[PDB]
């Protein structure tokens, strides 16, 4: 089960429902695509990876690589982060 | 009331740095004050003589944010088992994806200039609320 | 080994594992659960290279080392409308503002 996220821009990324429901905002933005007005999709797009990383080392003994955040796009992505609350 | 105990007893211990950050290892004393001891570079070890009963937290030296030890927060010596040391193996914990920017915007912006960021003002106070072991030592008491 | 991908077409991203055992031909069955387009309507591809049905995404170099988690590998996807196949085309996506002075 899947659900698509739609970026400011257009651009729509289908991940797994459970990984979605990483966010509490989406949860309830759900209760099945979500339409995001203010978030662009070079922001977007690092929130679906955060999702894996997150789902897929949570709870895992092997070794925790650190995310990734290029300088340019921290600013946007701490305030989708910060509206998403994860 | 989080201090270490005084057993005595000592308690040979490897610290294991399997982060990529700079590790700054801390002992919490007798009366609960933190102690720093010598950090550890990424990728590295140390066999250490500590005690049973002594607690230790691990933090990145430079920003003090916050690290694991085997999988929780503190770390507490305990028996060694025909001559075996114990294994304190510090890892990344998985950091929500707002402390993580918050992490990356401070190591780019001056305390300063925290300010003059086009953001809403409650990320302005999360950004200068930084991670600090006294504010921990509060929430873990 | 798990892979992570991202499989792209136009202004679609879906994101998927999949195994590196795995065919190119069992990642369309996956496309076809998602888009609902059956896999001789599809074309995957890695960079410009079309991909074939029965290679491994191994064989064809995603491996659990390079498509990971929190940097996935895209594979490109093109449609056949009716007859033929559409061309390869991957909607880039928006860029990033300066950065500001203080950063
Ligand atoms: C009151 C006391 C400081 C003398 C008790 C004591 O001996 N402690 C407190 C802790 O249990 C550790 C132990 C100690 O200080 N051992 C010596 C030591 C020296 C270097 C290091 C070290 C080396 N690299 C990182 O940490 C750790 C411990």
Redesign the interface.
């Known amino acids: 089960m899947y659900v698509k996220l739609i970026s400011s821009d257009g651009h729509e990324f289908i991940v797994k429902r459970e990984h979605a429901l990483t966010s509490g905002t989406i949860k309830a933005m759900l209760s099945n695509e979500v339409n995001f007005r203010e978030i662009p999709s070079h922001v977007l797009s690092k929130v679906c990876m955060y999702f894996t990383y997150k789902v897929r080392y949570t709870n895992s003994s092997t070794e925790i690589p650190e995310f990734p955040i290029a300088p340019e796009i921290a600013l946007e992505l701490l305030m989708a982060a910060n509206f998403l609350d994860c | 009331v989080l201090r270490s105990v005084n057993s005595r007893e000592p308690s040979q211990v490897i610290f294991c740095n399997?982060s990529?950050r700079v590790v700054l290892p801390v002992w919490l004393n007798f009366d609960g004050e933190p102690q720093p001891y010598p950090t550890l570079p990424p990728g590295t070890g140390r066999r250490i003589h500590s005690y049973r009963g002594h607690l230790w937290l691990f933090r990145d030296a430079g920003t003090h944010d916050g690290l694991l030890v085997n999988?929780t927060e503190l770390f507490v010596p305990s028996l060694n088992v025909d001559g075996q040391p114990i294994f304190a193996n510090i890892?990344?914990?998985?950091?929500?994806?707002?402390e993580?920017?918050?992490q990356?915007?401070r190591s780019?912006?001056?305390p300063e200039?925290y300010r003059?960021?086009?953001?809403?003002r409650?990320?302005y106070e999360?950004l200068e609320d930084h991670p600090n072991v006294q504010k921990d030592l509060e929430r873990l008491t | 080994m798990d892979v992570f991908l991202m499989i792209r077409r136009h202004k679609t991203t879906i994101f998927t594992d999949a195994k590196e055992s795995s065919t190119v031909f069992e990642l369309k069955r996956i496309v076809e659960g998602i888009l609902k387009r059956p896999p001789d309507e599809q074309r995957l591809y890695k960079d410009d290279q079309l991909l074939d049905d029965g290679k491994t995404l191994g064989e064809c170099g995603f491996t659990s080392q390079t498509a990971r988690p929190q940097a996935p590998a895209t594979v490109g996807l093109a449609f056949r409308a009716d007859d033929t196949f559409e061309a390869l085309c991957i909607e880039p996506f928006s860029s990033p503002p300066e950065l500001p002075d203080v950063m």
Do not use: A, E, F, W
């Open positions: 399997r990529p999988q890892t990344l914990p998985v950091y929500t994806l707002k993580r920017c918050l990356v915007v780019l912006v001056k200039n003059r960021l086009d953001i809403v409650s990320l999360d």
